[PDB]
Amino acid sequence: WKDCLSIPYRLIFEKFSGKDPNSKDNSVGIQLLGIVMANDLPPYDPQCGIQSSEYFQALVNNMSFVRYKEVYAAAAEVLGLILRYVMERKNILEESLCELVAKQLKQHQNTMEDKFIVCLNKVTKSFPPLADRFMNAVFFLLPKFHGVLKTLCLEVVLCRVEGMTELYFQLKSKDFVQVMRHRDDERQKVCLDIIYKMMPKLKPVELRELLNPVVEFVSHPSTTCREQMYNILMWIHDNYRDPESETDNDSQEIFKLAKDVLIQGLIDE
């Protein structure tokens, strides 16, 4: 349909703010505010009937209602796209706003650890920024939680990757020796999805140490996982196909492996 018809913030308000919930219902204003994100994000930018930072403070309180699995987490989606929106609409609040978001995560990942790692994944995944202040305290929990929270803790590190902690001196044992060797297809998927972007910052030493446990995916029933093992191997190949001569012998002998295990791709299931 034509134009945009920007909605009065009065409507939007009550639907996330009427009753501080003991209930599912208040995720209605959360859905709604998500729709003035959804349609290429028309003007939100509150003026009429209500004032900005309080409107957001009430909005961040929605992730406090931890009795119900769909209620609390949803707020951090809507709020993560506020950052995408206020970042790229560039609105002038953004400094003290970002300190309020940092303050909100810092009050409550301190006391609600899963629910606020999930929150730092709705932030970070839905728009990247906030985790920079925290990152030590995220790597912190990746060995404490298995399963879905393995994948979401990984997915925070992933979505906000900036090479934190010179990574192998955090990680050279701590995950990639054996969490890489650990079963669940989605865990393995996000895991190779980490591998596939760490490329430019690997030295040939760890590239040798890490390619070999990736070569293991030659066994794997998921073409969806195995493709990324190939995206990887293709990157290895193209970057370590032999120039004129090398000091770093692995920078053609990881290739002397890759240039074979690509052949071991050519037959596949």
CA distances from 233 to 88, 155, 180, 207, 220 (A): 36, 22, 16, 11, 15
Alpha carbon distance 109, 91 (integer Å): 27
Pair 204, 254: CB distance under 8 Å = yes
For 52, the token pair is 């900005």
Q: How far apart are CA 52 and CA 240, in angstroms?
A: 53
What CA–CA distances, in Å, run from 75 to 68, 96, 127, 142, 255? 13, 20, 14, 23, 47
How is residue 222 annotated by DSSP?
-
Nearest to 224 by CA among 198, 192, 267, 201: 192
N-term to C-term CA, the chain: 47
- CA-wise closest residue to 104 among 84, 85, 82: 82
**Identity at 35, one-letter amino acid code:** I
Helix ranges, the chain (H): 9-17, 27-38, 52-60, 72-88, 94-108, 113-125, 136-139, 147-159, 168-171, 185-198, 204-215, 223-240, 250-261
Q: CB under 8 Å, gap of 24 or more: what pairs does 186-192 form?
A: 186/151, 187/147, 187/150, 187/151, 187/154, 188/217, 188/220, 188/222, 188/225, 189/222, 189/224, 189/225, 189/228, 190/151, 190/154, 190/155, 190/158, 191/154, 192/217, 192/225, 192/228, 192/229, 192/232
- DSSP class of residue 2 equals -
Asked if residue 11 lies in contact with residue 40, where contact means CB atoms within 8 angstroms, the answer is no
Token pair 């929605």 is found at 62
Q: Phi first, then psi: give them for residue 245, nearest 5 degrees.
A: -165, 160
Instruction: Indicate the DSSP class of residue 7.
Output: P
Q: For the stretch 156-191, what's the b/e string if a residue is b when 16 or more beta carbons lie within 10 angstroms of its beta carbon?
A: bbbbbbeebeebbeebeeebbeebbeeeeeebbebb
The dihedrals phi and psi of 204, each to the nearest 5 degrees, come to: -60, -25
8-state DSSP, 92: T
Is residue 241 within 8 A of residue 255, CB to CB? The reply is yes
For residue 195, how many other CB atoms are within 10 A of its CB?
20
Q: How far apart are CA 214 and CA 231, in angstroms?
A: 11
Crossing angle of helices 27-38 and 72-88, rounded to 10°: 30
* Cα–Cα distances in angstroms (integers) from residue 86 to residues 92, 103, 187, in the given order: 8, 18, 32
Residue of 89, 62, 64 whose CA lies nearest to 6: 89
Cα separation, 213 vs 179, whole angstroms: 11
